[PDB]
């Protein structure tokens, strides 16, 4: 996984 | 957004 812009499971806005 | 499944900017694992 990791950090940026895309789609899946985690913490995002 | 927040913690869950979907699309945007953040951390995905």
Resolution, expressed in angstroms to one decimal: 1.1
Q: How far is A10 from chain B (nearest CA, A)?
A: 4
Three-state DSSP class for residue A1: coil
Both tokens of residue B10? 């953040």
Q: Identify the H or E element spanning A4.
A: strand A2-12
- Residue B13's Cβ-count burial label (10 Å; 0-12, 13-18, 19+) is exposed
Both tokens of residue B2? 């927040």
Closest of A8, A3, A2 to residue B3, by C-alpha: A8
Write out chain B residues lying below 8 Å of A1, CB-based.
11-13
Write out chain A residues lying below 8 Å of B1, CB-based.
11-13
Structure-determination approach: X-ray
State which residue of chain A sits closest to B3, comparing Cα positions: A11
Contact B11 A8 (CB under 8 A): no
Q: Distance between alpha carbon A8 and the CA centroid of its chain, in Å?
A: 6
């Amino acid at each position: 996984x990791x950090v940026x812009x895309x789609x899946x499971v985690x913490x995002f806005d």
